[PDB]
Structures are given as structure tokens and as C-alpha cells.
């Protein structure tokens, strides 16, 4: 019942033009850190050595599951990086089957291993019976899809499974062969419903039966939800996807009664304005990022033991926050909408 400690065995090496084919052959799943060359100062060297140690621990933990880790220097190994498609420094590229999955989240052994374990699972989860259907309906912090097919041999299910591989493990794909589940979901045979994160009502993919290409293109177009949750596994991907250099950031601790009350108002506002293409709200639950809470309180000058919502300038990390006297001074849906209007029409921005 005790956490693993690094055993000193060198399992993570630099992946270069000489060895890369043998590395790909040695491992069923290969995760490659694409990194800039470390600077020569002692601090950057120490930081680089500590980064490699993180991969060594993950490689030890996942050795018996066919996972390997490597490192690609973006300058020294620029040619191999180009052939393999490694373009974003500090991203980890995970090779499973015919897909290349970009990891752009917290660089920690625990978060990396959890991600790899999700990668190793199958990309479609079946739903049969009432309890499994309830488990499906409880998912709201992720975009999700569900389709109804004849059986696992259906050409349309196989297209659906192939599409699921493209977005694995970020967007869970569900399938049912149970006409009673499908009827409850209002899914006609071979229809696919896309449930945007935190939305109650789905969007049916048009022109069924759907091909892999029709599903992929649909998901790409609905990928960005009106309300999306910051998660360690994807925090930098989410944070780097700003809209004109602005994030609306809502802090709410889901388990706290005041956070829940505010989060419920936020969800209701997102649902009523889900079609506004200029509206994108990031919900950060502070309990998921304890090491950042003091930094956020200092940088934004807010008390994160209470709900908050603001506009964040990503370049200078400048901000403006809705004025709430305390945790009990929460805005109504109408007040929150109007405040959002002000941020969108520019009435409320960091540059004033």
C-alpha cells in the first residue's frame, strides 16, 4: 500500500535519428516529451534533470503495461521531431495505434500515469441497463457522445469507434445496443447525440448514419464548450485557448455550499447562452489546484474561500472581478448575464 520510489534504472533516453525506430518497436505505447534544449546554467540543468526523473518514475510504474517514455530535443533532434509531428514544446506526444495524442497538462508523475492509464483503455464504453445509463447521465464536466447501433459488428458502430480514437481520452464516446436505453435517450438507430459539457439538452449529429469523417468534423466544431472546467490533465491546453487574449474565470468549490450555489447559477447562465459563440467561461475548482491557490489569491487579489468570477488578461495576468461583498452576496442569473454582457461588449475589461 506504498507509493513507488524510483529504482535508478535508466528507462528514459533521448530519442534521436539513430534510435527512434528501435524505440517505437520496443514499446506498444510511447510517450515523447518534446522539449527545448536545456540552458547551460546549473539551475536549468537541475530543472532538466528533475524533469527527466518525473518520466523515469512514470516509466517504471508503467513498464509492465507496455508504456515507454522518451525525450526529443527540439533543436538537436529537430529532424526527427519534424518527421514524427512534434511541434509544441513541453507537450508530451503519446503514440497509440494509428493515433497521436497530445498531452498538454500538469507535468507530474501522478498526472502523467493517470493520463496514460486512460489512453490504454478502449475508446468506447457500452451502456446497458438502467444503472449504467445513470452513470452516463452523471457525466457533465466533459463533452460526451452516445450512439445507438445494432451491435458491435455494425459498420456504423465501427465508424463510431474509429472516430472515438481521434479524441481519446479527452471526449468519452458511449454506445448502446439496447433499444430500451436508446428509446429513453430518444436515440433512433444509428443516431448520435453530442452532449456539450454542463448542458442538459444534446445536439443530434445530422445526416445519419454517420461516417468517421462526419463525426470527427462535428466534434471538432463543437469541441469548445460554453462552460469548461480546468483540469490538471489539460490545464495548459485549456489556458492556451484564449479568445482574443481574454479568459473569463469563475472560481467555485463544488463541495462547498456557497460554491455549489454559485456554480448552479453559472451552469444555468451557460445553458441559456450556450449558442453565443463569443462566450467561453473557465470554471476552476480551487480544491483541484491547492499549490496554486495562494498564488491566485495574491495575483488577482481575491479571497478564494468564496466564489469569484472575473476577466483575465493572459499576457500581463491583469484582472477585474465581479464585486461580491462576501460568499452570501452571490449574483442572480440576470445579474450574471448582464455582467457577462459587459465583458463581451467591452464595458468591463482589464485595460480601463
Ligand X SMILES: *[C@@H]1O[C@H](CO)[C@@H](O[C@@H]2O[C@H](CO)[C@@H](O)[C@H](O)[C@H]2NC(C)=O)[C@H](O)[C@H]1NC(C)=O
Enumerate the known binding-site residues. 10, 12, 14-15, 52, 56, 71, 77, 88, 99, 102, 104, 106, 110, 114, 118, 125, 132, 166, 169, 186, 191, 196, 207, 209, 214, 226, 237, 240, 242, 244, 246, 253, 256, 258, 261, 274, 287, 327-328
Three-point CA angle 88, 91, 93, nearest 5°: 100
- Nearest-approach distance from CB 351 to Ca ion, in angstroms: 26
Order of strands, sheet of 203-204, starting from the edge strand that comes earlier in the sequence: 124-126, 173-176, 144-148, 192-195, 203-204
- Choose from a second copy, Ca ion, ligand X, none: what does 274 bind? Cβ within 5-8 Å by kind: Ca ion
Which of 15, 32, 33, 109 is in the footprint of a second copy by CB under 8 A?
A: 109
CA separation for the pair 318, 315 (Å, rounded): 8
- Single residue of 73, 77, 104, 285 touching Ca ion by CB under 5 A: 104
CB burial readout 128-143, b (16+ within 10 A) else e: eeeebbeebeeebebb
Could you tell me which stretch among 85-93, 209-217, 258-266, 268-276 binds a second copy (CB under 8 A)?
A: 258-266
Question: Which stretch in 21-29, 103-111, 163-171, 181-189 sits in contact with a second copy by CB under 8 A?
Answer: 103-111
Query: What is the dihedral angle through the alpha carbons of 224, 227, 233, 239, rounded to the nearest 10 degrees?
Result: 70
Q: Which of residues 175-234 bind a second copy (CB under 8 A)?
A: none
Minimum separation from the CB atom of position 291 to Ca ion (A): 7
User: Is 317 a binder of a second copy (CB under 8 A)?
Assistant: yes
Name which of Ca ion, a second copy, ligand X, none residue 109 binds, using a CB cut-off of 5 to 8 Å depending on partner kind. a second copy
- Residue 61 as a binder of a second copy (CB under 8 A): the answer is yes
Q: Binding a second copy by CB under 8 A: which of 121, 213, 329, 335?
A: 121
Among 239, 246, 271, 321, binds a second copy (CB under 8 A): 239
Q: Which residue from 45, 87, 179, 186 is in contact with Ca ion, where contact means CB under 5 A?
A: 186
Rounded Cα distance between 145 and 153, Å, is 19
Amino acid at each position: 500500500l506504498d507509493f513507488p520510489e524510483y529504482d535508478g534504472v535508466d528507462r528514459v533516453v533521448n530519442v534521436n535519428a539513430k534510435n527512434y525506430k528501435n524505440v517505437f518497436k520496443k514499446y506498444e505505447v510511447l510517450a515523447l516529451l518534446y522539449h527545448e534544449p536545456p540552458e547551460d546554467d546549473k539551475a536549468s540543468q537541475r530543472q532538466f534533470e528533475m524533469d527527466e526523473l518525473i518520466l523515469e518514475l512514470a516509466a517504471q510504474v508503467l513498464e509492465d503495461k507496455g508504456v515507454g517514455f522518451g525525450m526529443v530535443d527540439s533543436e538537436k533532434d529537430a529532424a526527427v521531431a519534424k518527421k514524427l509531428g512534434l511541434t509544441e514544446e513541453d507537450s508530451v506526444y503519446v503514440f497509440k495505434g494509428d493515433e497521436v495524442i497530445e498531452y498538454d497538462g500538469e507535468f507530474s508523475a501522478d498526472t502523467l500515469v493517470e493520463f496514460l492509464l486512460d489512453v490504454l483503455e478502449d475508446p468506447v464504453e457500452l451502456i446497458e441497463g438502467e444503472r449504467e445509463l445513470q452513470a452516463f447521465e452523471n457525466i457533465e464536466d466533459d463533452n460526451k457522445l452516445i450512439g445507438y447501433f445494432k451491435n458491435k459488428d455494425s459498420e456504423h458502430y465501427k465508424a463510431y469507434e474509429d472516430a472515438a480514437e481521434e479524441f481519446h481520452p479527452y471526449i468519452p464516446f458511449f454506445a448502446t445496443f439496447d433499444s430500451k436505453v436508446a428509446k429513453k435517450l430518444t436515440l433512433k438507430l444509428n443516431e448520435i447525440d453530442f452532449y456539450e459539457a454542463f448542458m442538459e439538452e444534446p445536439v443530434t449529429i445530422p445526416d445519419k448514419p454517420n461516417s468517421e469523417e462526419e463525426i470527427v468534423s462535428f466534434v471538432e466544431a463543437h469541441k469548445r464548450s460554453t462552460l469548461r472546467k480546468l483540469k490538471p490533465e489539460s490545464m495548459y491546453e485549456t489556458w492556451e485557448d484564449d479568445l482574443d487574449g481574454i479568459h473569463i474565470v469563475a472560481f467555485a468549490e463544488e463541495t462547498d455550499p456557497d460554491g455549489y450555489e454559485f456554480l448552479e447559477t453559472l451552469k444555468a447562465v451557460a445553458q441559456d447562452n450556450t449558442d453565443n459563440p463569443d462566450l467561453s467561461i473557465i470554471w476552476i475548482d480551487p480544491d483541484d489546484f491547492p499549490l496554486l491557490v495562494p498564488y491566485w489569491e495574491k495575483t488577482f487579489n481575491i479571497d478564494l474561500s468564496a466564489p469569484q468570477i472575473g476577466v483575465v488578461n493572459v499576457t500581463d495576468a491583469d484582472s477585474v472581478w465581479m464585486e461580491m461583498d462576501d460568499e452570501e452576496d452571490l449574483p442572480s442569473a440576470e445579474e450574471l448575464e448582464d455582467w457577462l454582457e459587459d465583458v463581451l461588449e467591452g464595458e468591463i475589461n482589464t485595460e480601463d
